[PDB]
RNA sequence: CUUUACUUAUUCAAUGAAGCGGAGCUGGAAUUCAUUUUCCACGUUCUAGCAUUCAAGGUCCCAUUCGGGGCUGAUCCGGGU
RNA sequence: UGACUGUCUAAUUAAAACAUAGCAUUGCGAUGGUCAGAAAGUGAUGUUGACGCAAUGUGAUUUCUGCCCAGUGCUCUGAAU
RNA sequence: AAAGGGAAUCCGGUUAAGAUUCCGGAACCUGGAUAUGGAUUCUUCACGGUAACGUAACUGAAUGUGGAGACGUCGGCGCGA
């Protein structure tokens, strides 16, 4: 084409006003964006104790998917299912003449912090899931130690939202299985065996290890430069 | 018993500057990628007179690197710059009078002006007329530069602080006698209300520490402590010596 | 992870949806009537000797009008009440706090006959 | 219940576990406004025992005041 | 006066040359001469720089 | 009861928070010493001109609609302005 | 007697008093000097930068400014049970 | 800001007392709508002059640049009312 030519612009210094580049690294973000970014920066710059940072070791993706596959079989009743079984019980009370033999025994996950803590204390919990992302952390930070103390198996698992979805909440912060049906006892035993290997059997060694201390990108670069050069 | 005249200057009622006619804050160009990595060419379009300042100001127009427009900066004109002169500002600038380049990238004995104290505060040192800063040192292991200021003070600045080559224009201004209170009146009329100065010995004792008495004398010593308080410091504050500078 | 390519280093407030008001009850639900209609505007004629010399000579009807009426409202009120067409309105606030309008009718209308039809002179 | 554990844990203010959280939280509270709305109590047990029930109409405000 | 320029026609506010009512026929002449000569010296500088970087 | 290292608290300053930090083509006075032990340079200096339309070009796709969207031009990574 | 022009005690003092230019001394290189504010993410100088700002003394020009650092004041990389 | 910057109104007459405001004549400015004539157009967005520039017109968004607004005081000289 003899009508089109090659201009190329000289985007150096002092020539050819600069093109639109991705300036997302340099955006003056809102103050809440900066606070929530520098907060997760500051929580890993400082030397975290071993009571926090026994969190951020989380149940990994395959065994968390297995854990939620088991725990979704024991979802609690929705409001619609509660209304259906309450109508079924009101039928058997009014005309069926059956006392408490209308609905069968429920198998469901246990949830709520006080309820789950009391189940751990009374040694009824067969498996406890602890959300890694609660705020304040003081609500669950005693729970690995309490679960190790009463011998129930715990798993610090990723997502208070994910734990809330299986209990039909927005956020659950713990979940617990206290009893399963007969067909899930082998699945629960396999899960407890692969969860205890990461959480309860590593507790006494994680209890001595401080987390954090992580330098930034630039500071780590200029620290391994000095380490290499000395 | 009365608040005295040097104490009254901090409230800043009538003692503010008279800044109607001033061209703007005479500052260096802001430290950007062009000035930090290469150079940028601006053009002197006017050498104007600043009011209340003894030195002229060079209105130097640069091109904005990121938006198509023109960014006009107000430099203090070094002595020798002219209209239509290309002013090259940055690290890779050449050693010509008027260029704005860092103190690390100049030789020893270079004479700069409008030179910074910290890299990027846009001109702090040697800005009055005829004044200059001599570059007497470099310390590349700590990125410093030893300079000699107009007062004789040796100062250590960063080597990334900038300065404009040359002496500030308008030199030799104080060598002419003002000859009259009219010329002093019109001098201070565009600076600030620091004139005329009544002597404190002419005052009453309520107006000044020096005031009062049947004879105009000072009474106590004029040399006042540095740790003295506001209201006592009317004399020679924290004087190391007094009398004529002879040995 | 796709990241939004921001060519500006400024964050601005996003254009969220602004809904219109859909109130559960009206603010007053009985609207006020016309606060300044033709009878509120044209209060009374002015029948001084000067104001009557303006009627048969200058084709000008002199009125005392509302203090809240502008020349559009005075023109509309004179056209609506007295069925004339108005060439000009010249108002002044009198030194007793009333307003006086000099309403010049067009040459089609004789202001002395309009004044006679109204009732004064 | 968990609030007994929160009660006994909050008393240990010079332990490592709360000393870290005091630092990490005092930075963030300083970065926010002087009077700002708290979305939920950072001491839920202390809120409950001082009167707060977690329902509509109960509000937490965080606030900093100059010492001395 | 500055708002009277809104009243008059386009002829009264400009000259038919480039930079009509902005520049004054010798400034325009200088801008043209400078634009021609510097953009030829740029070509000369380009081939001299290419020669000197192609020699070694 | 001495010194200097870290940065995230705290303090200072600037900017429309634009090019920060690390790593990557040539070149050599690395005598490649088989290896970038190894450093510097990152498109602009006769001239009071001009520089803007997601950029021309190169290339791919559309389903092509006389137009549109990618990649590149303008290296990659880290979102620490 | 004050160099001069100028200024002031409105309503008893217009002066030889105040100011002045000239001279001199002092402090300060900004994380600063001098001075405000109850405080402040606060101010004046300062749209400033030693030919500048701030504190004083003397008071055009000519010709000079002698001795005393014991006292008091100011100041000093200085003395270390 | 009724003394600074500023879109545009003048003459004649008129009242006991109003007028650059009323009346008569003659204008101008701003905002809006919009038709007709002209102009430009098969070289689609005019032409002449070497040129300074001329004309009744004679497309021009973003963006940029420039001008006007917009400027001391004194002295004599020139021109006008
Ligand atoms: Mg932080
Ligand atoms: Mg001011
Ligand atoms: Mg004096
Ligand atoms: Mg006296
Ligand atoms: Mg009136
Ligand atoms: Mg009126
Ligand atoms: Mg920036
Ligand atoms: Mg006298
Ligand atoms: Mg008197
Ligand atoms: Mg008298
Ligand atoms: Mg005197
Ligand atoms: Mg004398
Ligand atoms: Mg003596
Ligand atoms: Mg005016
Ligand atoms: Mg008249
Ligand atoms: Mg009159
Ligand atoms: Mg008229
Ligand atoms: Mg036609
Ligand atoms: Mg024509």
Curated annotation (Swiss-Prot), chain A:
Subcellular localization: Cytoplasm
GO process terms (BP): cytoplasmic translation; maturation of LSU-rRNA
SUPFAM superfamilies: L30e-like (SSF55315)
UniProt GO MF annotations: RNA binding; structural constituent of ribosome
Gene3D superfamilies referenced in this protein's UniProt entry, alphabetically: 3.30.1330.30
Keywords for this protein: Cytoplasm, Ribonucleoprotein, Ribosomal protein
Example of a GO cellular component annotation carried by this entry: cytosolic large ribosomal subunit
Stated role: Component of the ribosome, a large ribonucleoprotein complex responsible for the synthesis of proteins in the cell. The small ribosomal subunit (SSU) binds messenger RNAs (mRNAs) and translates the encoded message by selecting cognate aminoacyl-transfer RNA (tRNA) molecules. The large subunit (LSU) contains the ribosomal catalytic site termed the peptidyl transferase center (PTC), which catalyzes the formation of peptide bonds, thereby polymerizing the amino acids delivered by tRNAs into a polypeptide chain.
Family: Belongs to the eukaryotic ribosomal protein eL8 family.
More details: Present with 238000 molecules/cell in log phase SD medium.
The protein's assembly and partners: Component of the large ribosomal subunit (LSU). Mature yeast ribosomes consist of a small (40S) and a large (60S) subunit. The 40S small subunit contains 1 molecule of ribosomal RNA (18S rRNA) and 33 different proteins (encoded by 57 genes). The large 60S subunit contains 3 rRNA molecules (25S, 5.8S and 5S rRNA) and 46 different proteins (encoded by 81 genes).
Entry-linked PANTHER family: RIBOSOMAL PROTEIN L7AE FAMILY MEMBER
UniProtKB/Swiss-Prot annotation, chain C:
Disulfide links within the chain: none
Keywords: Cytoplasm, Isopeptide bond, Ribonucleoprotein, Ribosomal protein, RNA-binding, rRNA-binding, Ubl conjugation
GO cellular component: cytosol; cytosolic large ribosomal subunit; preribosome, large subunit precursor
Localisation per UniProt entry: Cytoplasm
Sample GO molecular function, one term: rRNA binding
Cross-link (Glycyl lysine isopeptide (Lys-Gly) (interchain with G-Cter in SUMO)): 40
One GO term (biological process): cytoplasmic translation
Pfam families per record: Ribosomal_L23 (PF00276), Ribosomal_L23eN (PF03939)
UniProt-listed NCBIfam families: PRK14548.1 (NF011118)
Similarity field: Belongs to the universal ribosomal protein uL23 family.
Function: Component of the ribosome, a large ribonucleoprotein complex responsible for the synthesis of proteins in the cell. The small ribosomal subunit (SSU) binds messenger RNAs (mRNAs) and translates the encoded message by selecting cognate aminoacyl-transfer RNA (tRNA) molecules. The large subunit (LSU) contains the ribosomal catalytic site termed the peptidyl transferase center (PTC), which catalyzes the formation of peptide bonds, thereby polymerizing the amino acids delivered by tRNAs into a polypeptide chain.
Protein name per UniProt: Large ribosomal subunit protein uL23
Recorded name of the encoding gene: RPL25
Swiss-Prot record, chain D:
Localization, UniProt: Cytoplasm
Family: Belongs to the eukaryotic ribosomal protein eL15 family.
Note: There are 2 genes for eL15 in yeast.
Purpose of the protein: Component of the ribosome, a large ribonucleoprotein complex responsible for the synthesis of proteins in the cell. The small ribosomal subunit (SSU) binds messenger RNAs (mRNAs) and translates the encoded message by selecting cognate aminoacyl-transfer RNA (tRNA) molecules. The large subunit (LSU) contains the ribosomal catalytic site termed the peptidyl transferase center (PTC), which catalyzes the formation of peptide bonds, thereby polymerizing the amino acids delivered by tRNAs into a polypeptide chain.
Subunit structure as annotated in this protein's UniProt entry: Component of the large ribosomal subunit (LSU). Mature yeast ribosomes consist of a small (40S) and a large (60S) subunit. The 40S small subunit contains 1 molecule of ribosomal RNA (18S rRNA) and 33 different proteins (encoded by 57 genes). The large 60S subunit contains 3 rRNA molecules (25S, 5.8S and 5S rRNA) and 46 different proteins (encoded by 81 genes).
Protein name (record): Large ribosomal subunit protein eL15A
Section covered of the full-length record: 2 to 69 of 204
From Swiss-Prot, chain E:
Subcellular location: Cytoplasm
Subunit annotation: Component of the large ribosomal subunit (LSU). Mature yeast ribosomes consist of a small (40S) and a large (60S) subunit. The 40S small subunit contains 1 molecule of ribosomal RNA (18S rRNA) and 33 different proteins (encoded by 57 genes). The large 60S subunit contains 3 rRNA molecules (25S, 5.8S and 5S rRNA) and 46 different proteins (encoded by 81 genes).
Miscellaneous information on this protein: Present with 23600 molecules/cell in log phase SD medium.
Family: Belongs to the eukaryotic ribosomal protein eL34 family.
Function of the protein: Component of the ribosome, a large ribonucleoprotein complex responsible for the synthesis of proteins in the cell. The small ribosomal subunit (SSU) binds messenger RNAs (mRNAs) and translates the encoded message by selecting cognate aminoacyl-transfer RNA (tRNA) molecules. The large subunit (LSU) contains the ribosomal catalytic site termed the peptidyl transferase center (PTC), which catalyzes the formation of peptide bonds, thereby polymerizing the amino acids delivered by tRNAs into a polypeptide chain.
Protein name: Large ribosomal subunit protein eL34A
Gene: RPL34A
Full-protein positions shown: 58 to 113 of 121
